[PDB]
Structure formats: structure tokens, C-alpha cells
Amino acid sequence: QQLVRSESAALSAQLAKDKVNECVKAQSKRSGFCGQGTHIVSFVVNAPNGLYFMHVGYYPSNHIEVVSAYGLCDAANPTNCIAPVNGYFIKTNNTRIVDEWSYTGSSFYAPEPITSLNTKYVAPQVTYQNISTNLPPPLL
């Protein structure tokens, strides 16, 4: 009986080692591991015969549906288009922003003007919207 239990303990200890060098020492993007809320810092304390882990996590709430586009473009020059980085292009619903479209964070709803910091150039695609007038990122 002791031989069996000792072996299972060793395997369990290996798991703990893996979590300390992933889930604890750094943020992890793979999910599954850690708490079920994306991942943010976690902590570990001593416990009898083992380690006790605590995981801080992010839980989203109050989801809403919004209109969004695959990308935006200059209708006068279909040879340079853009797409958001780590966020989305959504139709504007905010009185502060005069722009037809706005950038948002992906973890939380929060509109912002579209700027080069939030975009990357991409090859053109048929599903991108054609903006024939005011698009500042790039203006040209």
C-alpha cells in the first residue's frame, strides 16, 4: 500500500512543479490551467503534505451584442487595408466619438478612436468595409 501511495505522490509532485514554473511564476495564456478566468497572478502557500494554490482570475459579465467588421478600408485605394490589433472595429454608439467606427478592447467593452497604435496593415479582402471619406489611420 505504501509503495502505491508513494508513487502517486511523486507524480502529483511533478504536477505541482509544473504549475509553479508556469501558473505561478508567469501569466499563462493557454487557459485550462490556473483559475477559469483567463489568467492573472496566482499565489502558493504551504499546506500539510503539499502545496495549496490560489488563483486570481477575471470573470466577464453583462455581455452585449454589437455590430463589428472584419476590417476597414480606403475605398479610393483598395491596395492598403487595416485591421485592429487585440481588439475589434465596432460601429460607434458613443456621443463622444464623431467617427463611424471605433476600436475596443477585447476583454472589456470600451470604445476608442481608431489610431495607428491600435492597427496593423493587412492584405485587402472582400469583406472589409469600404470607407470613401474620413479615415485618419493612415489619412493617406
Epitope: 455590430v67 454608439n93 458613443n94 456621443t95 463622444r96 466619438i97 464623431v98 467617427d99 478612436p113
Partner: antibody, heavy 119, light 111 residues
Framework: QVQLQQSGPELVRPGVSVKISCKGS????????IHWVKQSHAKSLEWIGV????????NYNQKFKGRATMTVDKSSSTAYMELARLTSEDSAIYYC???????????????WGQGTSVT | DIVLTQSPASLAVSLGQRATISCRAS??????????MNWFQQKPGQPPKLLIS???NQGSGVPARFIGSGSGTDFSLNIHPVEEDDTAMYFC?????????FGGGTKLEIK
């Protein structure tokens, strides 16, 4: 208690730029874009432009891009517009308005200034 | 922006009469089903007043008597209880595209 305060009317001579104001009251001024409209007749009105009061971003009717421009004094909670190069054809009743979304993704004029005029 | 027109150029009615106004667009205004249509009210000596929006026939500063209708290029405004103080010019407005133009309007009157 929202109100807009347009500046008084003037019989301005041609070739003179014309400045008009529309101070906000009863709300935080920086949270809403300002819109301007030109009324040359009760049957003839056209949009002039829009100005964000937080980012300073604008759009203009293409016909006025070489003409009127807009600014905001965030500490006076007021919006201003100035028409370059007045001509007799520019006499009009001018109206500022406050942006709103009574419907999702639909811009609406909401509150209106009492109106001002120039000739 | 899409061109807007309206008819009849003026309408006169008996008090408490139902009444409507036709409004047409040069191009359909529906985008993602949004419509973007606003109607306004104006009387001399005063600024225009927002009445309704394509999905708002109540609220937006008015009683439920102001019912917007239609889709695509055709729209209308319908009021079952017209009253003497409802006489005003009325204006369709398009929020779909810059310049954000709007119609010259029509005028309601009591006979």
C-alpha cells in the same frame, strides 16, 4: 436642465470672418459632440459640421472645408465656430445641437440652441 | 448622403383628424437593419425638435401618437390625434452618411 447658449446675431459686412458660439449648460460638456446647421430658409437647411468636445475630432460638410472651422474652450464649456470669408449668400439662421443615441448606432440632434443669425 | 423628399408639400386637417406624411429616399437607408431615420418638428421663431427615430415611436421627447413607418426608400409619419398645437413643419433626416442631409420638409395646418 440641459441648455445651449448661442451668441447674439450680427449684421456683419462681407469679407469678414464670423465667429459664433454655443455654450453648454446642465451637463458635462466634454461628453457630447456638437453639431452645427445652417438655415437659409425654413425650407432650406443643411448640416455644417460636427466637433468632438473631448478629442477635438471633426467632420465638415465638404462645401465648408475651405470655409468655416470649429474650436472648443473646454474650461468655458463652450463651442465655437468661425466662418471664413463672409458673403451675402452666407446670411442664415445658425443652429448648434447636441449629439445623442436614442437608438443604437443612430445619431440624433437632441437639444438645440435657440438660434442666432448673421447678415 | 442619400437625397430625401417629402409630400404633400402641405396638409390641412380638421381637429382630431388622423394624418400622415410621405417621405422618400433616393437610395435605401438600411444598413445592418439600422435604418438611421429621424423625424423633426419645427415652428417659426423656434429651433427644430426631435420627434422620433426609426425604432423609437415613443420617447425621444414625444408621445406615442407619433408613429414612424416604412423601410428601404419609403418612410412615413403617422399621427391619429392631430391637434392645433401639432401644426409644424416636419423634416425627415438621414443619419446614415455624411453630409447627414435632411429634407426641406412639409407643413401641417388646421383648416
Amino acid at each position: 436642465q440641459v441648455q445651449l447658449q448661442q451668441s447674439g446675431p450680427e449684421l456683419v459686412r462681407p469679407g469678414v470672418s464670423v465667429k459664433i458660439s454655443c455654450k453648454g449648460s446642465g451637463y458635462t460638456f466634454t461628453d457630447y459632440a456638437i453639431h452645427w446647421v445652417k438655415q437659409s430658409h425654413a425650407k432650406s437647411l443643411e448640416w455644417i459640421g460636427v466637433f468632438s468636445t473631448y478629442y477635438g475630432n471633426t467632420n465638415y460638410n465638404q462645401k465648408f472645408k475651405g470655409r468655416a472651422t470649429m474650436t472648443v474652450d473646454k474650461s468655458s464649456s463652450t463651442a465655437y465656430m468661425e466662418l471664413a470669408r463672409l458673403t451675402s449668400e452666407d446670411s442664415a439662421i445658425y443652429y448648434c445641437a447636441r449629439k445623442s443615441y436614442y437608438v443604437d448606432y443612430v445619431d440624433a440632434m437632441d437639444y438645440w440652441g435657440q438660434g442666432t443669425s448673421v447678415t | 448622403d442619400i437625397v430625401l423628399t417629402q409630400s404633400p408639400a402641405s396638409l390641412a386637417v380638421s381637429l382630431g383628424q388622423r394624418a400622415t406624411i410621405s417621405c422618400r429616399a433616393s437610395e435605401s437607408v438600411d444598413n445592418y437593419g439600422i435604418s438611421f431615420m429621424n423625424w423633426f418638428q419645427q415652428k417659426p421663431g423656434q429651433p427644430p425638435k426631435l420627434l422620433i427615430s426609426a425604432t423609437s415611436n415613443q420617447g425621444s421627447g414625444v408621445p406615442a401618437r407619433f408613429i414612424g413607418s416604412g423601410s428601404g426608400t419609403d418612410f412615413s409619419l403617422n399621427i391619429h390625434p392631430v391637434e392645433e398645437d401639432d401644426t409644424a413643419m416636419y423634416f425627415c433626416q438621414q443619419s446614415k452618411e455624411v453630409p447627414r442631409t435632411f429634407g426641406g420638409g412639409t407643413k401641417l395646418e388646421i383648416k
